[PDB]
């Protein structure tokens, strides 16, 4: 462990914490929370706090449901801002049923499920290195976001300077001085676009850190008259945002993807694991790419993938293997975007990985040069399948895949489809202005 | 023939026509023309006038290819308003290849081609009674259309009073002067929505009239400071515009759907015709509903059909059989909208119809009870398939159907699919504000 | 009168189609069309094919006269049915010379590079000249095009007889003077002044700092 009961109780009093956030996540990755006064800390810690866990369903919510909040002492942090009438702290939580057993519909409990699944396969840890990219827009006079970007910088160029706003900096600085362990940051292709990358960790810790990240970001940028967004494709004709996930499996504390005397120094396991991501992509896209707008980013020309394939050096491969070996031997899935619920994504990915490891699946040819030109037909004759063009399509594929459905859980699954189909249904019946411009005088 | 080149030449003079409009239609429904001074009437009549035939292929045009214009003297018309300097007149023309053969790309030639099929099966005529519905919005100071309607009238309401505007009256009064045979007009179920019904007529002559119609409407509308539109679904949340087509088959000038001592007075010739529409509807939709915006009209809640089935009394059936019998015995198709290209719509329809007659297709049970209650499973488990949700689907479907492909023509089919696909691809990559509204703060 | 402004400016709007003024030409010898030869390939006479050949020869030279203004070279850009290469065909996307279908009396060569800003008396002078210079010297026309101008590369178009038009007024001018047959087609007075005015027009243009240049560099540098 990291923190013990009394360690926490000492921390709270000394640091003058006065407001605890009991933090959790809903199906739509949205970050929920029940918040108590410091004085309630005890009730909390004894796992006695109750709330309406149907909040987990998001808007598909129908009936109320009393559930318990189980804090996780090791996820205890004190927020650096705060300090008004006292400081704030949080606890990430696992949602239990009123009968003491963990609530399945909880995404955090769901990953812990597939993780245990991994251990039965005899593995030690599942590592994630995420690279979450975001846009910073400006807030208008009313304090309302606009389409104005925070700068005009590009890829990796030093911008903005150290005199003023410099969100990215102040974010990494806050994160670092707040327990985080960041690797690096940089400006991204599109103007106003940014990326912070954290050191790898185990799935749960990595997903918890992604949810805390987003928040800390959203927060910092608001503080500088800016609006942060993790919306995949906010603007047509510019780069969208994505969250490539760097994945690695350990066995007995040792990377199991690596192998010196091998080809590419990638272990047989590696090759199999990859194999799995290859055959489940089209059927797990709906989860890694959960919003309607997610598929507007999945268009050719913007670094984002569009076909199921893996390379070591290509324009925009679904999967790619970075240079480093040894401990850094890893598989990177580049489909995933920020909108995705980290817990659901990691669980649907781990699950597809293990599946290919379990059933010893044969990884396909690594793609050399050109998936862009090589038209549909040819691309097909090479076993290169296209991702779903729309959320609708993505759903029809997810619903067809037995193992992917099992990765979610009857409850999580049922409600996730429920949400997405209504989400799509709305967007489909909507008459966008584009239609009016194209058709109103034409016809 | 209604005129002889002498009555034409005579009339042109006594009436002082100074400008001839040789009008034809492109594959995209659009109404085109080449204008020549009266001093060239002779060159036109002798089928000598040339132009860029590839204009028929619309925006997917690549190379330029000359072609002739053969004016149909029976389609002669002297526009009423036209003055100052002299009058104007028109000729609907057929497109011929530089080498005397008819251009296979011309949608008007196509109809005539399918119509011939009909003749081979001994039927004399194929009749159409179209129900063209359209919206009327206001022009701003700049002469630009607005989202504001010219009235707040309702279904069959006495729209605009006989003082001033009354566009629907003037349209009809002008149409009647031009030797039109109008059955009756009326206000439709939404503010600014109008309808004018024509007397039944033969497929070609009626199809020609539809085109002329939208012209006259367009013209007079502006004349009143308004903007006519046949866009199937101008605005989300109100009724869409459709163009039902009352179809009937004649075997030597004697309605072949009528059958006195018969079940519902519908002959077996009729019953088959229904069947053909039923099986093919899903496949001919991309043609009768050519626009992206077309599928926003094909949504539950209005009178527009969302699934295949015929009935004599229903909420919104794809096929409906009106009361009148004898010479008035007809099948009504209610999916077609005013954006569809008349000549193509009839070819694809005649095509599915005849396909059902010659193959003695068995028509399904007519629906009666609320299909609105039966969901997919229920509807599915019966002869009730859903129509295509998006242009994309309507296209795949269409291009799958061998008999609906032979209905169009290789030339016409090649480009129609090309245009439509790009139309779709442009819409798919577009980022609409709705998306920014939904996601820019949620994520 | 109708409250509008007509322009014959070649390319008023970036990214939209430009205005051209194709020219259908024909030579008559004894009241008959010297271009029509019903019996030879494409019913085109040896007279006709020669004429075409000369246009192919002097195209890159006369473009400064048939497309005089600076804006004219903005229309000479790929994508809009305006020719960019010296070539001919009876049927292609954007040929410099097109041969229409009509035969007999209607047998003609259409030159598609000419824009409406050209001077009609100079554009025909130069065009007739390149054409007379072909018949006079019996010049051989190359092969027409099948279907690959914008498709291949400049180095590829090059590995054939297909050269590009000048990409600028300044470039087109340097080509105009290089040619003696074309210069003579105007003559001392017309030639000297045209050059003097066009060169100026061009120096004027090239010293100008545009909003585009400020949009890209003002901040980036
Ligand atoms: N790898 C990169 O930095 C490119 C990110 C790009 N926005 C994407 O969607 O993948
Ligand atoms: N007659 C009706 O009410 C049907 C028209 C309806 N607007 C459809 O579309
Ligand atoms: N299609 C055409 O008429 C070609 C003319 C074109 N605007 C050039 O320049
Ligand atoms: Mg429920
Ligand atoms: Mg990146
Ligand atoms: Mg990356
Ligand atoms: Mg073509
Ligand atoms: Mg109606
Ligand atoms: Mg009706
Ligand atoms: Mg021309």
Coordinates of C-alpha atoms in Angstrom, one line a residue, chain A residues 28 30 137 145-147 218 227-231 233-236 291-293 295-296 298-300 339 376 389-390 420 423-424 426-443, chain B residues 28 30 137 145-147 218 227-236 291-293 295-296 298-300 339 389-390 393 420-421 423-424 426-436 439-443:
Chain A
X28 CA -19.9 8.0 -20.7
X30 CA -18.0 11.6 -17.5
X137 CA -10.2 27.7 -27.1
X145 CA -16.3 29.3 -25.2
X146 CA -15.7 30.5 -28.8
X147 CA -14.0 28.9 -31.8
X218 CA -10.3 21.5 -17.6
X227 CA -11.8 26.4 -22.6
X228 CA -10.1 23.0 -22.8
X229 CA -11.8 20.2 -24.8
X230 CA -11.1 16.6 -25.5
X231 CA -13.7 16.6 -28.3
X233 CA -12.9 16.7 -34.0
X234 CA -14.0 20.1 -32.8
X235 CA -13.2 21.7 -36.2
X236 CA -13.6 20.4 -39.7
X291 CA -19.1 9.7 -29.7
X292 CA -20.8 10.5 -33.1
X293 CA -18.2 13.2 -33.6
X295 CA -15.9 9.3 -36.5
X296 CA -15.4 12.8 -38.1
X298 CA -11.5 9.0 -38.4
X299 CA -11.1 10.5 -41.8
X300 CA -8.0 10.2 -44.1
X339 CA -13.9 11.1 -25.3
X376 CA -10.7 -0.2 -51.2
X389 CA -17.6 5.1 -41.0
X390 CA -20.2 6.1 -38.4
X420 CA -25.4 5.2 -28.2
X423 CA -27.3 9.5 -29.3
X424 CA -27.1 8.4 -33.0
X426 CA -30.9 12.2 -32.5
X427 CA -28.0 13.2 -34.7
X428 CA -29.6 11.3 -37.6
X429 CA -32.9 13.2 -37.5
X430 CA -31.3 16.6 -37.0
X431 CA -31.3 18.9 -40.1
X432 CA -27.9 20.5 -40.1
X433 CA -27.4 23.9 -41.8
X434 CA -25.0 22.2 -44.3
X435 CA -28.1 20.5 -45.8
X436 CA -29.9 23.8 -46.2
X437 CA -26.9 25.4 -47.9
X438 CA -26.5 22.5 -50.3
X439 CA -30.2 21.9 -51.1
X440 CA -32.5 24.8 -50.4
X441 CA -31.9 26.6 -53.7
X442 CA -30.5 23.6 -55.6
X443 CA -33.9 21.9 -55.2
Chain B
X28 CA -29.3 15.4 -60.9
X30 CA -31.6 20.0 -62.5
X137 CA -40.0 31.3 -47.3
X145 CA -33.8 33.2 -48.5
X146 CA -34.5 33.1 -44.8
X147 CA -35.9 30.5 -42.4
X218 CA -39.8 29.1 -58.8
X227 CA -38.4 31.7 -52.2
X228 CA -39.9 28.4 -53.4
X229 CA -38.1 25.2 -52.4
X230 CA -38.7 21.5 -53.0
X231 CA -36.1 20.5 -50.5
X232 CA -37.6 17.4 -48.9
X233 CA -36.9 18.5 -45.3
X234 CA -36.1 22.2 -45.0
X235 CA -36.5 22.2 -41.3
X236 CA -36.3 19.7 -38.5
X291 CA -30.5 13.8 -51.5
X292 CA -28.8 13.4 -48.1
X293 CA -31.5 15.6 -46.8
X295 CA -33.5 10.7 -45.3
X296 CA -34.4 13.3 -42.7
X298 CA -38.0 9.5 -43.9
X299 CA -38.4 9.7 -40.2
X300 CA -41.4 8.6 -38.0
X339 CA -36.1 16.4 -55.2
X389 CA -31.8 5.2 -42.9
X390 CA -29.1 7.2 -44.8
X393 CA -27.5 2.6 -47.2
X420 CA -24.2 10.4 -54.7
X421 CA -21.2 8.8 -53.0
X423 CA -22.4 14.0 -51.9
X424 CA -22.4 11.5 -49.0
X426 CA -18.8 15.4 -48.2
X427 CA -21.6 15.2 -45.6
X428 CA -19.9 12.5 -43.6
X429 CA -16.6 14.4 -43.0
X430 CA -18.5 17.6 -42.3
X431 CA -18.5 18.8 -38.6
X432 CA -21.9 20.2 -37.9
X433 CA -22.6 22.7 -35.1
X434 CA -24.9 20.2 -33.4
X435 CA -21.7 18.2 -32.6
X436 CA -19.9 21.2 -31.3
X439 CA -19.6 17.5 -27.1
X440 CA -17.5 20.7 -26.8
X441 CA -18.4 21.0 -23.1
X442 CA -19.3 17.3 -22.3
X443 CA -15.8 16.4 -23.3

